[PDB]
Amino acid sequence: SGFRKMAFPSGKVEGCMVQVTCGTTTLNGLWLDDVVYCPRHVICTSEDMLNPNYEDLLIRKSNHNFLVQAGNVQLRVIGHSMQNCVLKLKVDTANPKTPKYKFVRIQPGQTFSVLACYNGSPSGVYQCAMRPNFTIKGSFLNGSAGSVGFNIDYDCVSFCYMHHMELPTGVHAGTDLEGNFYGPFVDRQTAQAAGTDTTITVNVLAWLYAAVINGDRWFLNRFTTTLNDFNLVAMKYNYEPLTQDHVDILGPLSAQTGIAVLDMCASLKELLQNGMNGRTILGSALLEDEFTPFDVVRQCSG
Amino acid sequence: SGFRKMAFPSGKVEGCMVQVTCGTTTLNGLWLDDVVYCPRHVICTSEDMLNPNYEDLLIRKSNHNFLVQAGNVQLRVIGHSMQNCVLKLKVDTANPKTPKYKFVRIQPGQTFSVLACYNGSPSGVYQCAMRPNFTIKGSFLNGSAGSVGFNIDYDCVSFCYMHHMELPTGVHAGTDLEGNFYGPFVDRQTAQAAGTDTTITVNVLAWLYAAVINGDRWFLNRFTTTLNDFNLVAMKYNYEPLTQDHVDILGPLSAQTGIAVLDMCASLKELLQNGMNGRTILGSALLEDEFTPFDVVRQCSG
Numbered sequence A, B: 001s002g003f004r005k006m007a008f009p010s011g012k013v014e015g016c017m018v019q020v021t022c023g024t025t026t027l028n029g030l031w032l033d034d035v036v037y038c039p040r041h042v043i044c045t046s047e048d049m050l051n052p053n054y055e056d057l058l059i060r061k062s063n064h065n066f067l068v069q070a071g072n073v074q075l076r077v078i079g080h081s082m083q084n085c086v087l088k089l090k091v092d093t094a095n096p097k098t099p100k101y102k103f104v105r106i107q108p109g110q111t112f113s114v115l116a117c118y119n120g121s122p123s124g125v126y127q128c129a130m131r132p133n134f135t136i137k138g139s140f141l142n143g144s145a146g147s148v149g150f151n152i153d154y155d156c157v158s159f160c161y162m163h164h165m166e167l168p169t170g171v172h173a174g175t176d177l178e179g180n181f182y183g184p185f186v187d188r189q190t191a192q193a194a195g196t197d198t199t200i201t202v203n204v205l206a207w208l209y210a211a212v213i214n215g216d217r218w219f220l221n222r223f224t225t226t227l228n229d230f231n232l233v234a235m236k237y238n239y240e241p242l243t244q245d246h247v248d249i250l251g252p253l254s255a256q257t258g259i260a261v262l263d264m265c266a267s268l269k270e271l272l273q274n275g276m277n278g279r280t281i282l283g284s285a286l287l288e289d290e291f292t293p294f295d296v297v298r299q300c301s302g
Ligand SMILES: CC(C)(C)[C@H](NC(=O)C(F)(F)F)C(=O)N1C[C@H]2[C@@H]([C@H]1C(=O)N[C@H](C#N)C[C@@H]1CCNC1=O)C2(C)C
Pocket: A027, A041, A044, A049, A140, A141, A142, A143, A144, A145, A146, A164, A165, A166, A167, A168, A172, A186, A187, A188, A189, A190, A191, A192, B001
């Protein structure tokens, strides 16, 4: 038992991380087969980052302007192109540690692991969720662009996120691996702001089930509610509305604990209207929404 | 910016994880050079686990009672011995992925990453602290014994923990890699209980500095206190007393923020006596004590 914010083991991704330098800008790249993927703003100076014209900037570069290092070994760039907000660098050597992989775009509410890297070197791994406003609450410093987010499915790495920038509220924005931003952001140093965020209700319910599985039961009650009555109060507290598909997704956890979904919604309703009043749930004094139903099953079942 | 519970990248450890079977008991082992380390209770049946005599149990086994699998490959056991609570299995093949490593015993208050494994297969990575009562608040299911805890120093993996068992409060106990338990526990299925835990004060102060570095300043005040006046109130709230060496250790964070240690102790004193009153710090409504000063510097500096 126990319950922790758990990341996927990162070894399969560590073998793909490289350093990419162009000019005096160094950031991280992802080396799969004979292609290195990295944020396109590697081709920018500080002058360019306020209003870059990336088409112009790219035609002014040649292959030998790109310095790619995989640890000690230099990789020779033999071709480049830009796909939306990423650069694709063709190199002369295919990465022998290329895992089975795919590129997937995730949805708000889903979680993934982040391998934070600097100068091509992995520094740390942590779990986060894609927020409803398409930002992530990460931990990133200068030089972290090109760090990637991923899930592991069986033997297969699904890459879902490449880091680009930090917004002024201290949250983070990036693209999928095809270079398309999550959310309404652009890779230029202008005034951009995230929209208002909401709490991911299905995830909160999943975490309440994790609590019951681990013996925290004080918030339960014998009441029940309906989907519409619950959604009515949830709107008022900036919670995402709950769908029948969410109820279905919580099925395995309902079965394991013998507590029906709409039963646990009535518990959540009371916690929203009355607070915790100084008690905790799984060691937290706030309602946690960055564990999916799948995360909970994976950790509380295996 | 941002602040997350961050684990070390696990790749260097993933390459050392093997599956160890003896009888119908399967658990994890650590394969370094030509030795596999695993919990000695792998040699137990369910009968034996209530009152094992491990000397007797071990002499009744031969090398061929031990099935060791590194993924697909079988390793041939050519010798065994017991060192305190671990078993050392000599195998015919040295692990070619052996990293530079050392065995270190950590102190209460220090943090490390855990690579949770089942059947020799890495499942997840998370950060935890060794509590003052020598337990860890982990997340472990049946089959997880032999999972290891580690820090990475430069190119060198320091192994500090091997998982053995869960106590009845749902916390976890294990040994260093020389087989010596942390805390007053034994590897038999008897009634054992952890002593009372306390809050790790130097870590709470480190986390308050992380908060200031990230722009959370509401809890600051212009007051100051002395080490003895602070320690006097901390005792009453089950906080570890603060030493001059702790003050020294917080130096880099004091310098970076321009807020003296004893200055921030006065802030902590007020938070203990008055609570948060519904505000949060770095997204938490409770005082967090599982980040060391080094963790904070590492994440808020690099
Ligand atoms: C003001 C700030 C935080 C420097 C800027 N932010 C915005 O202009 C805002 F609009 F998003 F607010 C921004 O992040 N960048 C500007 C420039 C890089 C991108 C950038 O410096 N990347 C960093 C890299 N490697 C990662 C950043 C640094 C702090 N922590 C991170 O995650 C471009 C091409 C977008």
